[PDB]
mmCIF file with all atom_site columns, C-alpha atoms in Angstrom:
data_model
loop_
_atom_site.group_PDB
_atom_site.id
_atom_site.type_symbol
_atom_site.label_atom_id
_atom_site.label_alt_id
_atom_site.label_comp_id
_atom_site.label_asym_id
_atom_site.label_entity_id
_atom_site.label_seq_id
_atom_site.pdbx_PDB_ins_code
_atom_site.Cartn_x
_atom_site.Cartn_y
_atom_site.Cartn_z
_atom_site.occupancy
_atom_site.B_iso_or_equiv
_atom_site.pdbx_formal_charge
_atom_site.auth_seq_id
_atom_site.auth_comp_id
_atom_site.auth_asym_id
_atom_site.auth_atom_id
_atom_site.pdbx_PDB_model_num
ATOM 1   C CA . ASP I 1 1   ? 5.237   5.590   16.326  1.00 49.84 ? 10  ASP I CA 1
ATOM 2   C CA . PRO I 1 2   ? 5.253   2.232   14.502  1.00 51.26 ? 11  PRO I CA 1
ATOM 3   C CA . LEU I 1 3   ? 5.617   3.918   11.107  1.00 51.92 ? 12  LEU I CA 1
ATOM 4   C CA . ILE I 1 4   ? 8.746   5.745   12.285  1.00 52.76 ? 13  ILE I CA 1
ATOM 5   C CA . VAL I 1 5   ? 10.255  2.922   14.307  1.00 50.61 ? 14  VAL I CA 1
ATOM 6   C CA . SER I 1 6   ? 9.857   0.540   11.378  1.00 50.07 ? 15  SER I CA 1
ATOM 7   C CA . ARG I 1 7   ? 11.318  3.135   8.958   1.00 54.19 ? 16  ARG I CA 1
ATOM 8   C CA . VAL I 1 8   ? 8.262   3.001   6.686   1.00 54.95 ? 17  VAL I CA 1
ATOM 9   C CA . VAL I 1 9   ? 8.366   6.721   7.198   1.00 52.76 ? 18  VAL I CA 1
ATOM 10  C CA . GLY I 1 10  ? 11.932  7.128   6.048   1.00 48.90 ? 19  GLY I CA 1
ATOM 11  C CA . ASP I 1 11  ? 12.384  4.330   3.512   1.00 47.86 ? 20  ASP I CA 1
ATOM 12  C CA . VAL I 1 12  ? 9.034   4.753   1.725   1.00 47.46 ? 21  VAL I CA 1
ATOM 13  C CA . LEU I 1 13  ? 7.270   7.876   2.908   1.00 46.69 ? 22  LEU I CA 1
ATOM 14  C CA . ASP I 1 14  ? 7.873   11.352  4.175   1.00 41.07 ? 23  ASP I CA 1
ATOM 15  C CA . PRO I 1 15  ? 6.316   12.304  7.522   1.00 41.06 ? 24  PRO I CA 1
ATOM 16  C CA . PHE I 1 16  ? 2.618   13.025  7.240   1.00 37.08 ? 25  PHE I CA 1
ATOM 17  C CA . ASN I 1 17  ? -0.436  13.637  9.383   1.00 39.02 ? 26  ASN I CA 1
ATOM 18  C CA . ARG I 1 18  ? -2.822  10.731  9.679   1.00 41.89 ? 27  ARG I CA 1
ATOM 19  C CA . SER I 1 19  ? -6.185  12.111  8.610   1.00 44.70 ? 28  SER I CA 1
ATOM 20  C CA . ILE I 1 20  ? -8.271  9.470   6.797   1.00 44.81 ? 29  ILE I CA 1
ATOM 21  C CA . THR I 1 21  ? -9.427  6.038   7.873   1.00 43.93 ? 30  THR I CA 1
ATOM 22  C CA . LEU I 1 22  ? -7.734  3.061   6.160   1.00 40.73 ? 31  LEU I CA 1
ATOM 23  C CA . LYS I 1 23  ? -8.832  -0.419  7.248   1.00 35.93 ? 32  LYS I CA 1
ATOM 24  C CA . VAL I 1 24  ? -7.243  -3.443  5.564   1.00 35.76 ? 33  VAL I CA 1
ATOM 25  C CA . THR I 1 25  ? -8.587  -6.867  6.513   1.00 36.23 ? 34  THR I CA 1
ATOM 26  C CA . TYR I 1 26  ? -7.446  -10.373 5.489   1.00 37.52 ? 35  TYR I CA 1
ATOM 27  C CA . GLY I 1 27  ? -10.041 -12.916 6.499   1.00 34.97 ? 36  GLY I CA 1
ATOM 28  C CA . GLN I 1 28  ? -11.036 -11.961 10.013  1.00 36.09 ? 37  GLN I CA 1
ATOM 29  C CA . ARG I 1 29  ? -7.724  -10.218 10.744  1.00 34.81 ? 38  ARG I CA 1
ATOM 30  C CA . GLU I 1 30  ? -7.517  -6.446  10.535  1.00 32.19 ? 39  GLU I CA 1
ATOM 31  C CA . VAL I 1 31  ? -4.011  -5.177  9.744   1.00 32.15 ? 40  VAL I CA 1
ATOM 32  C CA . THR I 1 32  ? -2.508  -2.899  12.382  1.00 31.55 ? 41  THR I CA 1
ATOM 33  C CA . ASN I 1 33  ? 1.026   -1.582  12.147  1.00 32.39 ? 42  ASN I CA 1
ATOM 34  C CA . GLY I 1 34  ? 3.619   -4.215  12.771  1.00 30.80 ? 43  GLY I CA 1
ATOM 35  C CA . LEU I 1 35  ? 1.329   -7.235  13.173  1.00 29.40 ? 44  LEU I CA 1
ATOM 36  C CA . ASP I 1 36  ? 2.704   -10.387 11.643  1.00 30.81 ? 45  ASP I CA 1
ATOM 37  C CA . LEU I 1 37  ? 0.725   -12.114 8.899   1.00 31.65 ? 46  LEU I CA 1
ATOM 38  C CA . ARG I 1 38  ? 1.644   -15.392 7.372   1.00 28.40 ? 47  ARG I CA 1
ATOM 39  C CA . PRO I 1 39  ? 1.973   -15.675 3.578   1.00 28.32 ? 48  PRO I CA 1
ATOM 40  C CA . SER I 1 40  ? -0.837  -18.210 3.738   1.00 35.07 ? 49  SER I CA 1
ATOM 41  C CA . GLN I 1 41  ? -3.188  -15.488 5.044   1.00 34.88 ? 50  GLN I CA 1
ATOM 42  C CA . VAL I 1 42  ? -2.463  -12.936 2.277   1.00 34.20 ? 51  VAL I CA 1
ATOM 43  C CA . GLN I 1 43  ? -2.774  -15.051 -0.888  1.00 31.62 ? 52  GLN I CA 1
ATOM 44  C CA . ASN I 1 44  ? -5.815  -13.071 -2.045  1.00 31.90 ? 53  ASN I CA 1
ATOM 45  C CA . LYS I 1 45  ? -6.527  -9.368  -1.927  1.00 31.42 ? 54  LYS I CA 1
ATOM 46  C CA . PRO I 1 46  ? -7.710  -8.006  1.418   1.00 28.88 ? 55  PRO I CA 1
ATOM 47  C CA . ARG I 1 47  ? -10.864 -6.099  2.042   1.00 31.87 ? 56  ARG I CA 1
ATOM 48  C CA . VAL I 1 48  ? -10.152 -2.388  2.172   1.00 33.49 ? 57  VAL I CA 1
ATOM 49  C CA . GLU I 1 49  ? -12.458 0.248   3.621   1.00 32.84 ? 58  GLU I CA 1
ATOM 50  C CA . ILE I 1 50  ? -11.644 3.940   3.687   1.00 31.04 ? 59  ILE I CA 1
ATOM 51  C CA . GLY I 1 51  ? -12.987 7.090   5.279   1.00 33.22 ? 60  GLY I CA 1
ATOM 52  C CA . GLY I 1 52  ? -12.814 10.514  3.685   1.00 32.83 ? 61  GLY I CA 1
ATOM 53  C CA . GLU I 1 53  ? -13.188 14.236  4.193   1.00 31.44 ? 62  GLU I CA 1
ATOM 54  C CA . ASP I 1 54  ? -16.093 14.805  1.793   1.00 35.31 ? 63  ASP I CA 1
ATOM 55  C CA . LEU I 1 55  ? -18.135 12.319  -0.208  1.00 34.46 ? 64  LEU I CA 1
ATOM 56  C CA . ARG I 1 56  ? -16.877 14.033  -3.411  1.00 36.06 ? 65  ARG I CA 1
ATOM 57  C CA . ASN I 1 57  ? -13.259 13.143  -2.618  1.00 32.76 ? 66  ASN I CA 1
ATOM 58  C CA . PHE I 1 58  ? -11.420 10.277  -4.366  1.00 33.01 ? 67  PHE I CA 1
ATOM 59  C CA . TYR I 1 59  ? -8.446  8.322   -3.036  1.00 32.42 ? 68  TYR I CA 1
ATOM 60  C CA . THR I 1 60  ? -5.641  6.133   -4.372  1.00 29.17 ? 69  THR I CA 1
ATOM 61  C CA . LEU I 1 61  ? -4.318  3.019   -2.606  1.00 25.74 ? 70  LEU I CA 1
ATOM 62  C CA . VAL I 1 62  ? -0.745  1.818   -3.159  1.00 22.31 ? 71  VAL I CA 1
ATOM 63  C CA . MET I 1 63  ? 0.578   -1.514  -1.798  1.00 23.09 ? 72  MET I CA 1
ATOM 64  C CA . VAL I 1 64  ? 4.327   -2.069  -1.838  1.00 23.52 ? 73  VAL I CA 1
ATOM 65  C CA . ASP I 1 65  ? 7.077   -4.227  -0.369  1.00 21.36 ? 74  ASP I CA 1
ATOM 66  C CA . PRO I 1 66  ? 10.210  -2.073  0.112   1.00 18.95 ? 75  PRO I CA 1
ATOM 67  C CA . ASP I 1 67  ? 12.321  -4.994  1.285   1.00 17.58 ? 76  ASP I CA 1
ATOM 68  C CA . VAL I 1 68  ? 12.972  -6.765  -2.013  1.00 13.83 ? 77  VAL I CA 1
ATOM 69  C CA . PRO I 1 69  ? 14.800  -9.044  -2.557  1.00 14.87 ? 78  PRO I CA 1
ATOM 70  C CA . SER I 1 70  ? 15.870  -8.637  1.076   1.00 14.35 ? 79  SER I CA 1
ATOM 71  C CA . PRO I 1 71  ? 15.617  -5.957  3.770   1.00 15.92 ? 80  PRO I CA 1
ATOM 72  C CA . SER I 1 72  ? 19.395  -6.007  4.036   1.00 14.33 ? 81  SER I CA 1
ATOM 73  C CA . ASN I 1 73  ? 19.993  -5.454  0.304   1.00 12.11 ? 82  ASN I CA 1
ATOM 74  C CA . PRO I 1 74  ? 16.749  -4.035  -1.042  1.00 10.49 ? 83  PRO I CA 1
ATOM 75  C CA . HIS I 1 75  ? 18.080  -3.298  -4.547  1.00 9.79  ? 84  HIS I CA 1
ATOM 76  C CA . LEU I 1 76  ? 14.645  -3.906  -6.189  1.00 8.67  ? 85  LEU I CA 1
ATOM 77  C CA . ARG I 1 77  ? 12.778  -1.591  -3.805  1.00 9.22  ? 86  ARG I CA 1
ATOM 78  C CA . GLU I 1 78  ? 9.833   -1.080  -4.005  1.00 11.14 ? 87  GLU I CA 1
ATOM 79  C CA . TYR I 1 79  ? 7.859   -4.008  -5.417  1.00 11.06 ? 88  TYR I CA 1
ATOM 80  C CA . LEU I 1 80  ? 4.351   -2.886  -6.457  1.00 12.67 ? 89  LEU I CA 1
ATOM 81  C CA . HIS I 1 81  ? 1.803   -5.428  -5.211  1.00 14.09 ? 90  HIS I CA 1
ATOM 82  C CA . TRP I 1 82  ? -1.476  -3.573  -5.936  1.00 14.14 ? 91  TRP I CA 1
ATOM 83  C CA . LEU I 1 83  ? -2.665  -0.159  -7.160  1.00 8.67  ? 92  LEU I CA 1
ATOM 84  C CA . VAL I 1 84  ? -6.278  1.072   -7.046  1.00 6.31  ? 93  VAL I CA 1
ATOM 85  C CA . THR I 1 85  ? -7.321  4.607   -7.951  1.00 6.70  ? 94  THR I CA 1
ATOM 86  C CA . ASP I 1 86  ? -10.481 6.709   -7.939  1.00 3.09  ? 95  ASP I CA 1
ATOM 87  C CA . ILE I 1 87  ? -11.808 5.170   -4.714  1.00 4.06  ? 96  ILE I CA 1
ATOM 88  C CA . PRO I 1 88  ? -14.810 7.232   -3.584  1.00 5.18  ? 97  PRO I CA 1
ATOM 89  C CA . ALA I 1 89  ? -14.680 8.591   -0.062  1.00 6.93  ? 98  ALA I CA 1
ATOM 90  C CA . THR I 1 90  ? -16.153 6.252   2.569   1.00 7.73  ? 99  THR I CA 1
ATOM 91  C CA . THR I 1 91  ? -16.172 3.210   0.244   1.00 8.00  ? 100 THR I CA 1
ATOM 92  C CA . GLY I 1 92  ? -13.269 0.880   -0.563  1.00 10.63 ? 101 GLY I CA 1
ATOM 93  C CA . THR I 1 93  ? -11.248 -0.745  -3.253  1.00 14.07 ? 102 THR I CA 1
ATOM 94  C CA . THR I 1 94  ? -14.101 -2.603  -4.942  1.00 11.92 ? 103 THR I CA 1
ATOM 95  C CA . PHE I 1 95  ? -15.512 0.807   -5.912  1.00 12.57 ? 104 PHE I CA 1
ATOM 96  C CA . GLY I 1 96  ? -12.265 2.090   -7.446  1.00 13.24 ? 105 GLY I CA 1
ATOM 97  C CA . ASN I 1 97  ? -10.312 1.399   -10.633 1.00 9.81  ? 106 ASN I CA 1
ATOM 98  C CA . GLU I 1 98  ? -7.750  -1.414  -10.323 1.00 10.39 ? 107 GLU I CA 1
ATOM 99  C CA . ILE I 1 99  ? -4.639  -0.192  -12.224 1.00 11.21 ? 108 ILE I CA 1
ATOM 100 C CA . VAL I 1 100 ? -2.384  -3.060  -11.142 1.00 11.81 ? 109 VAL I CA 1
ATOM 101 C CA . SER I 1 101 ? -3.883  -6.350  -9.976  1.00 11.00 ? 110 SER I CA 1
ATOM 102 C CA . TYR I 1 102 ? -3.134  -7.761  -6.561  1.00 10.84 ? 111 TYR I CA 1
ATOM 103 C CA . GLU I 1 103 ? -0.123  -10.063 -6.300  1.00 12.93 ? 112 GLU I CA 1
ATOM 104 C CA . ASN I 1 104 ? 0.356   -11.854 -2.980  1.00 12.92 ? 113 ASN I CA 1
ATOM 105 C CA . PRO I 1 105 ? 3.571   -11.153 -1.046  1.00 10.94 ? 114 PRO I CA 1
ATOM 106 C CA . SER I 1 106 ? 5.489   -14.321 -0.271  1.00 13.37 ? 115 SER I CA 1
ATOM 107 C CA . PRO I 1 107 ? 8.870   -13.414 1.218   1.00 10.02 ? 116 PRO I CA 1
ATOM 108 C CA . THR I 1 108 ? 11.700  -15.897 1.386   1.00 15.09 ? 117 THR I CA 1
ATOM 109 C CA . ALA I 1 109 ? 14.595  -13.754 2.706   1.00 15.63 ? 118 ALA I CA 1
ATOM 110 C CA . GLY I 1 110 ? 14.213  -11.876 5.988   1.00 17.05 ? 119 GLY I CA 1
ATOM 111 C CA . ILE I 1 111 ? 11.241  -10.031 7.400   1.00 17.69 ? 120 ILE I CA 1
ATOM 112 C CA . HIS I 1 112 ? 9.488   -7.878  4.856   1.00 17.01 ? 121 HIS I CA 1
ATOM 113 C CA . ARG I 1 113 ? 7.314   -4.875  5.517   1.00 12.90 ? 122 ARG I CA 1
ATOM 114 C CA . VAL I 1 114 ? 4.155   -4.900  3.399   1.00 9.34  ? 123 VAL I CA 1
ATOM 115 C CA . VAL I 1 115 ? 2.861   -1.336  3.241   1.00 11.70 ? 124 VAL I CA 1
ATOM 116 C CA . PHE I 1 116 ? -0.522  0.136   2.253   1.00 12.26 ? 125 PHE I CA 1
ATOM 117 C CA . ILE I 1 117 ? -0.596  3.868   1.549   1.00 10.75 ? 126 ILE I CA 1
ATOM 118 C CA . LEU I 1 118 ? -3.662  6.040   0.879   1.00 10.21 ? 127 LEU I CA 1
ATOM 119 C CA . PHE I 1 119 ? -3.551  9.367   -0.928  1.00 10.69 ? 128 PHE I CA 1
ATOM 120 C CA . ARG I 1 120 ? -6.149  12.040  -1.580  1.00 10.82 ? 129 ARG I CA 1
ATOM 121 C CA . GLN I 1 121 ? -6.489  12.883  -5.292  1.00 9.61  ? 130 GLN I CA 1
ATOM 122 C CA . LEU I 1 122 ? -7.199  16.379  -6.572  1.00 11.29 ? 131 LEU I CA 1
ATOM 123 C CA . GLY I 1 123 ? -9.992  14.750  -8.588  1.00 9.31  ? 132 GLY I CA 1
ATOM 124 C CA . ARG I 1 124 ? -10.501 11.701  -10.730 1.00 9.70  ? 133 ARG I CA 1
ATOM 125 C CA . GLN I 1 125 ? -7.540  11.180  -13.045 1.00 11.85 ? 134 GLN I CA 1
ATOM 126 C CA . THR I 1 126 ? -5.849  8.730   -15.404 1.00 9.14  ? 135 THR I CA 1
ATOM 127 C CA . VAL I 1 127 ? -3.025  6.659   -13.926 1.00 6.66  ? 136 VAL I CA 1
ATOM 128 C CA . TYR I 1 128 ? -0.750  4.329   -15.890 1.00 4.72  ? 137 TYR I CA 1
ATOM 129 C CA . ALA I 1 129 ? 0.465   0.952   -14.767 1.00 4.73  ? 138 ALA I CA 1
ATOM 130 C CA . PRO I 1 130 ? 4.227   0.373   -14.738 1.00 6.12  ? 139 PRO I CA 1
ATOM 131 C CA . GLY I 1 131 ? 5.729   -2.128  -17.117 1.00 7.32  ? 140 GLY I CA 1
ATOM 132 C CA . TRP I 1 132 ? 7.480   -3.881  -14.218 1.00 8.01  ? 141 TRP I CA 1
ATOM 133 C CA . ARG I 1 133 ? 6.508   -4.112  -10.560 1.00 5.79  ? 142 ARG I CA 1
ATOM 134 C CA . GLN I 1 134 ? 10.127  -3.897  -9.349  1.00 5.22  ? 143 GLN I CA 1
ATOM 135 C CA . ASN I 1 135 ? 11.835  -0.574  -8.627  1.00 4.83  ? 144 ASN I CA 1
ATOM 136 C CA . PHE I 1 136 ? 8.566   1.252   -7.999  1.00 4.65  ? 145 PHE I CA 1
ATOM 137 C CA . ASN I 1 137 ? 8.927   4.482   -6.028  1.00 7.13  ? 146 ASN I CA 1
ATOM 138 C CA . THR I 1 138 ? 5.907   5.651   -4.051  1.00 4.97  ? 147 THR I CA 1
ATOM 139 C CA . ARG I 1 139 ? 7.309   9.149   -3.462  1.00 5.24  ? 148 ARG I CA 1
ATOM 140 C CA . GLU I 1 140 ? 7.917   9.614   -7.196  1.00 5.54  ? 149 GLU I CA 1
ATOM 141 C CA . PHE I 1 141 ? 4.488   8.183   -8.038  1.00 5.21  ? 150 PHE I CA 1
ATOM 142 C CA . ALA I 1 142 ? 2.844   10.677  -5.670  1.00 6.40  ? 151 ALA I CA 1
ATOM 143 C CA . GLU I 1 143 ? 4.774   13.517  -7.300  1.00 3.88  ? 152 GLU I CA 1
ATOM 144 C CA . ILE I 1 144 ? 3.861   12.471  -10.842 1.00 2.40  ? 153 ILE I CA 1
ATOM 145 C CA . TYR I 1 145 ? 0.139   12.128  -10.050 1.00 2.00  ? 154 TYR I CA 1
ATOM 146 C CA . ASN I 1 146 ? -0.143  15.170  -7.747  1.00 2.00  ? 155 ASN I CA 1
ATOM 147 C CA . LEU I 1 147 ? -1.123  13.081  -4.738  1.00 2.00  ? 156 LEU I CA 1
ATOM 148 C CA . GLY I 1 148 ? 0.666   15.086  -2.051  1.00 2.00  ? 157 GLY I CA 1
ATOM 149 C CA . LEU I 1 149 ? 1.620   13.470  1.235   1.00 2.00  ? 158 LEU I CA 1
ATOM 150 C CA . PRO I 1 150 ? -0.264  10.344  2.382   1.00 2.00  ? 159 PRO I CA 1
ATOM 151 C CA . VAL I 1 151 ? -3.449  10.625  4.374   1.00 2.07  ? 160 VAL I CA 1
ATOM 152 C CA . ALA I 1 152 ? -2.995  7.137   5.881   1.00 3.90  ? 161 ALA I CA 1
ATOM 153 C CA . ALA I 1 153 ? -0.630  4.198   5.857   1.00 6.00  ? 162 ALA I CA 1
ATOM 154 C CA . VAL I 1 154 ? -0.508  0.800   7.542   1.00 7.89  ? 163 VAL I CA 1
ATOM 155 C CA . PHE I 1 155 ? 1.903   -2.123  7.284   1.00 8.78  ? 164 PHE I CA 1
ATOM 156 C CA . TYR I 1 156 ? 2.323   -5.694  8.382   1.00 9.09  ? 165 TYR I CA 1
ATOM 157 C CA . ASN I 1 157 ? 5.418   -7.863  8.722   1.00 11.45 ? 166 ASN I CA 1
ATOM 158 C CA . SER I 1 158 ? 5.706   -11.131 6.898   1.00 14.33 ? 167 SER I CA 1
ATOM 159 C CA . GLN I 1 159 ? 8.288   -13.856 6.570   1.00 14.47 ? 168 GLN I CA 1
ATOM 160 C CA . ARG I 1 160 ? 8.590   -17.340 5.128   1.00 17.61 ? 169 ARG I CA 1
ATOM 161 C CA . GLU I 1 161 ? 6.267   -19.848 6.753   1.00 16.35 ? 170 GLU I CA 1
ATOM 162 C CA . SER I 1 162 ? 7.147   -23.020 8.611   1.00 15.35 ? 171 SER I CA 1
#
């Protein structure tokens, strides 16, 4: 399973059951696990569409790079690239609340995993932005905000361009 082989499950997430649709698209390129994207393709926020269990459900999207400054010494893990909450089922990020604005990943050292994680919320709720994007912890965030295990996750690989 790409999420296990890449250690996204492990480094960032506990094992979970995929249950909700998460589609992340940059330009005309849909992200699928492990595809390579160039930094020049990800300068602006992607389109994000989600599924859902019931139209009354709300979801939170987290985007992180766990490989900062480098995958071999990731002492700033995780870097928070984007956070959007209160996304109504079957819609997407433009219908949610943007807690932390999108910052484009632009790795310079090694291959970085760029991970999108979707969580089901118990209901709408207030979420606070961190004061720094470095040293974010998705597992701890999910615990604080009662988000449970992920319902979906996808990642791409990116490295410095040539």
